[PDB]
Design a protein around this nucleic acid. Structure first.
Lengths: 307, 311, 206, 168
DNA sequence: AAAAGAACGGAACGCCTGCTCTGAACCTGTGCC
């Protein structure tokens, strides 16, 4: 039945936007998701359906809002019970990075259009909210095993550091880009606060137990995440100031919310840091050479500008 | 042979130490049950030894206090392990002792909630199953406990019925799984524990009309299952067919329809129940208000098909 | 009789408020065998969330007068009548000194509400509900023990573990009052629970 | 000296917290009588944190971390809700007061950096909350300026990390 | 010397908002009516 439905969708999707009927296309995607719930868990058609949809997603461009969101929701439901999607999220992060300009404002990127589903017009939370939702789920299940982790434990630690390490590269890609100023900026800082906390309980567990693999994760964590994150914080100042100009031309409420995650981002950095300090002395290893001193910012009231 | 020897060993533990001897005898029973699974005399020996140990623990309740800490530590270490039929049987037996049973019940509830949450997590993500294959199911062992203790045990039936009574209220997703588990264990013990059938029926009838404001759909479901399993149980539980109509016309949320359908064989084999419901019908239908008169007419309409139309 | 008849029926919504107000006005005038009749008739009829003030006023009016367990049956008829009563009494007892019917209905809600100790643990731990009032209630209102036996097991047992000295004092007073009951089975159960607490429990509890 | 210093900050913070909160412009010229108090309090805090510079004792650093965090939290909780309304009539006073407070809070970042540089367990026990509170103050100042339509003037900038009475 | 003690250091469940996605006939503009 899916085959009879795939033909209609690809014919509709390949057709010109004049004959689009996006309402049917959204239904054409939801029926796929609702009919993909009861496939054979180890069936070949499970893999075959995945091979087709990633081809369509990476080739076609579902310019419609829900069509892109709906199709992307489907592919993850199959790509959860079978594998981990951090490779896809990393790949998508490249396209949005290629879609816009970097935070540094002095570096350019090639087209690198690995997925055609995402494009310049889809830079909105259309995609960068869903993947962060998976980032929420990916870390949500990680806490469960870490809590259990608190003979095969060597395999347990190796797998987590692979997913977290790959995901750490992902966050590095987004954090260098100019994210849309909507709640996606907020949600990125909400998961960024969450991510550092999960970094702790594994280390907090191992206190009661040295490996260089853990150090290499920390070395990558310091190099590709922290200075970019703080620089990304400096980016937010420019974005909010420009965005706050749209004040119809009592902004107390908006200003507080627009910078609420920022302080707690710092705190989640140092609570991990304070216990990572604790580990270094108890672990007899100097882990701070890779990392950098925790930077901070001051302000200044422009008296002349008040005139 | 073994019962007196382990009784002497328990006396020695009372004189000596109990940290490891308890776990050792649990392990011995565990491998005995494993080797006997693939044994009625052995089961009678098991009943005798559990009776001896539960009597000893009831005499000295504080001696068994270390069991709680030991099992909590094991559960923290072992992910779902150590909840063998022997351990849970010992836990339920001392619950009937009425000493600190509330904390043991709370620990059991936390354990089963964690177990069903973990089962859902593993089912909803295979990536955790590959790295965490230690899928331990408390439901499987507790349901096997019904068959394990179905050989005339001293207090296994009482422990199981108390466990189910706590479970059904704990259910109030994880709540649905808890309700399903409680209903299944109650059905199993009703189909197994013959001499507690009347007591179980009376207790659930007392509980069935126990949550007027709160939903009791699970109650009516379990009552219907036990009645359809044993149609004449409530017949031996007489003087309650008339009693069950105390406040039936207060909160019809389909509860009245389910109750009527569950008890329908009793009405068609019990003329006194039919007469009493006829008497209640005059009061129900003549209620000037309309807040609850819908339940009366719905029940009467169902009854019209309840009685046969032979002739 | 007219109050019972009208409560047996359902009138217009607007006219419900005025007849309800007439009901609480006539509540104090109801005699010992007559006031409970109107009390249950209006308690069954009243099902309004705005009736929290009505419940507070009824508690204030019936405090002086305090089978007579029929009011407990009327409150039991409503399965989930806890919220309005507990909010009304929390608002009231935060200012009012105390009330015997307040404690009685709080106990009734615990064994229906399964959630009533929260104000109890709060007001007792914060300068309210003197043990003398509870002792006088137990001595006079014998229906409290006649209401149900696990009241002592529901309240005093948890009161022993309380950290506040007022909490444990109240628990000890409740246990002492419960020992004074004439129920031989209830007294034996209470004494067995007491010796269980003495044998096993916190050293202060022992 | 350290016990002197600890009790001095304790009493200073208790007095600061004892100040009335910020009414929504419910007073005319009473705010004037409730403004210079914060000026002298910030001056006292500046004097104490300068006293830190001489005595590098570990307990001194610990108590200063803890009670500077507590004081800045109290400032955020109480003063600024009052300070936003006083900004209308009073401009130079609040600006100078903010200058003094910012001068005071500058050294807390440096000494937190020193704490994490020296791996002082007792000292690293208090760094995260202090850093979060300082960030909260930085952003509350912007909030108040934007509330009084002075959002153009405000500007954030990275603070050059330094050791105690040093650089880098 | 860098060990305790217990007073110092610290954690969990509960709350309804000030939130942003969603909503709705409109009123405008312009090829059509």
């Amino acid at each position: 039945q899916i085959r009879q439905f795939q033909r209609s969708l690809v014919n509709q999707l390949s057709s010109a936007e004049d004959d689009f009927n996006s309402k049917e296309t959204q239904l054409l995607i939801t029926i796929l998701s609702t009919l993909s719930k009861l496939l054979d868990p180890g069936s070949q058609q499970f893999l075959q359906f995945l091979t087709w949809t990633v081809k369509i997603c990476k080739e076609n461009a579902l310019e419609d809002l829900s069509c892109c969101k709906g199709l992307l929701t489907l592919l993850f439901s199959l790509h959860v019970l079978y594998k981990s999607p951090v490779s896809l999220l990393r790949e998508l992060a490249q396209d949005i990075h290629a879609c816009l300009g970097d935070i540094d404002q002095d570096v350019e990127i090639e087209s690198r259009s690995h997925f055609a589903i995402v494009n310049v017009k889809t830079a909105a939370p259309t995609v960068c909210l869903l993947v962060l939702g998976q980032a929420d789920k990916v870390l949500e299940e990680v806490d469960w095993l870490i809590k259990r982790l608190t003979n095969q434990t060597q395999a347990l630690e190796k797998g987590v550091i692979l997913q977290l390490g790959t995901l750490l590269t992902v966050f590095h890609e987004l954090v260098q880009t100019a994210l849309p100023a909507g709640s996606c900026v907020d949600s990125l800082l909400r998961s960024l606060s969450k991510t550092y906390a999960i970094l702790t309980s594994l280390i907090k567990h191992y206190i009661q137990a040295v490996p260089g693999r853990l150090e290499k994760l920390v070395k990558l964590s310091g190099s590709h995440l922290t200075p970019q994150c703080y620089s990304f914080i400096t980016y937010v100042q420019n974005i909010h100031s420009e965005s706050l100009s749209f004040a119809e031309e009592t902004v107390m409420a908006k200003v507080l919310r627009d910078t609420k995650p920022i302080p707690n981002l710092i705190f989640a950095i140092e609570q991990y840091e304070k216990f990572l300090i604790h580990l270094s002395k108890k672990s007899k290893v100097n882990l701070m050479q890779y990392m950098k001193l925790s930077t901070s910012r001051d302000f200044r009231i422009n008296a002349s500008m008040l005139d | 042979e073994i019962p007196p020897l382990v009784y002497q060993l328990l006396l020695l533990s009372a004189k000596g130490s109990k940290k490891t001897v308890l776990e050792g005898i649990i392990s011995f029973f565990n491998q005995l049950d494993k080797r006997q699974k693939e044994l009625d005399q052995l089961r009678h020996v098991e009943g005798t030894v559990i009776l001896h140990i539960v009597s000893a623990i009831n005499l000295d309740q504080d001696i068994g206090e270390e069991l709680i800490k030991h099992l909590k530590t094991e559960q923290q270490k072992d992910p779902g392990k150590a909840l063998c039929p022997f351990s849970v049987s010992l836990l339920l037996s001392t619950a009937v002792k009425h000493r600190l049973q509330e904390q043991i019940f709370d620990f059991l509830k936390t354990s089963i909630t964690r177990s069903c949450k973990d089962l859902q997590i593993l089912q909803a993500s295979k990536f955790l199953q590959d790295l965490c294959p230690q899928q331990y199911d408390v439901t499987a062992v507790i349901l096997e406990v019904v068959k394990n203790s179905a050989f005339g045990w001293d207090h296994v039936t009482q422990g199981l019925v108390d466990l189910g009574f706590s479970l059904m209220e704990s259910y109030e997703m994880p709540a649905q799984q808890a309700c399903k588990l409680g209903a299944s264990i109650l059905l199993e013990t009703f189909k197994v524990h013959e001499p507690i059938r009347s007591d179980i029926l009376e207790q659930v009838l007392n509980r069935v009309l126990t949550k007027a404001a709160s939903p009791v759909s699970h109650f009516i479901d379990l009552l219907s299952n036990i009645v359809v399993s044993a149609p004449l149980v409530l017949q031996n539980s007489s003087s309650r067919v008339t009693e069950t109509f105390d406040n039936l016309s207060f909160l019809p949320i389909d509860t009245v329809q389910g109750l009527l359908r569950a008890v329908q064989p009793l009405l068609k084999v019990s003329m006194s129940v039919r007469d009493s419901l006829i008497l209640v019908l005059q009061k129900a239908i003549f209620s000037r208000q309309l807040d609850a008169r819908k339940a009366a007419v719905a029940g009467f309409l169902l009854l019209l098909r309840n009685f046969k139309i032979l002739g | 009789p007219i109050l019972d008849a009208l409560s047996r029926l359902d009138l217009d919504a607007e006219l419900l408020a005025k007849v309800r107000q007439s009901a609480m006005t006539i509540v104090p005038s109801v005699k010992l065998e007559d006031l409970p009749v109107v009390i249950k008739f209006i308690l069954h009829n009243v099902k309004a969330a705005d009736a929290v003030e009505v419940i507070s006023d009824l508690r204030k009016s019936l405090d002086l007068s305090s089978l007579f367990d029929v009011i407990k049956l009327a409150v039991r008829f409503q399965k989930d009548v806890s919220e309005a009563w507990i909010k009304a009494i929390e608002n009231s007892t935060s200012v009012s000194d105390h009330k015997v019917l307040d404690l009685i209905v709080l106990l009734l809600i615990h064994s229906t509400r399964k959630q009533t100790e929260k104000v109890l643990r709060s007001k007792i731990r914060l300068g309210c509900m003197p043990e003398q009032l509870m002792q006088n209630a137990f001595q006079n209102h014998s229906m409290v023990i006649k209401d149900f036996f696990p009241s002592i097991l529901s309240l005093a047992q948890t009161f022993l573990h309380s950290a506040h000295p007022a909490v444990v004092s109240f628990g000890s007073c409740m246990y002492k009052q419960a020992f004074a009951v004439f129920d031989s089975y209830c007294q034996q159960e209470v004494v067995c629970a007491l010796v269980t607490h003495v044998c096993s429990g916190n050293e202060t509890e022992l | 000296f350290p016990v002197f210093f600890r009790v001095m900050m304790a009493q200073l913070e208790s007095s600061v917290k004892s100040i009335p909160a910020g009414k929504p412009s419910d007073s005319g010229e009473v705010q004037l009588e409730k403004l210079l108090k914060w000026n002298i309090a910030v001056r006292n805090f500046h004097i104490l944190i300068n006293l830190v510079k001489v005595f590098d004792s570990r307990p001194v650093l610990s108590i200063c971390l803890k009670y500077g965090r507590l004081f800045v939290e109290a400032f955020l909780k109480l003063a600024m809700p009052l300070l936003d309304h006083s900004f209308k009539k009073h401009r130079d006073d609040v600006q100078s007061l903010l200058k003094t407070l910012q001068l005071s809070t500058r050294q807390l970042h440096h000494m937190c950096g020193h704490s994490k540089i020296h791996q002082d367990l007792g000292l690293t026990n208090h760094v995260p909350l202090l850093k979060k509170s300082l960030e909260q103050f930085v952003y509350r100042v912007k909030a108040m300026l934007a509330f009084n339509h002075c959002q153009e003037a405000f500007w954030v900038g990275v603070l050059k990390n330094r050791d105690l009475q040093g650089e880098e």
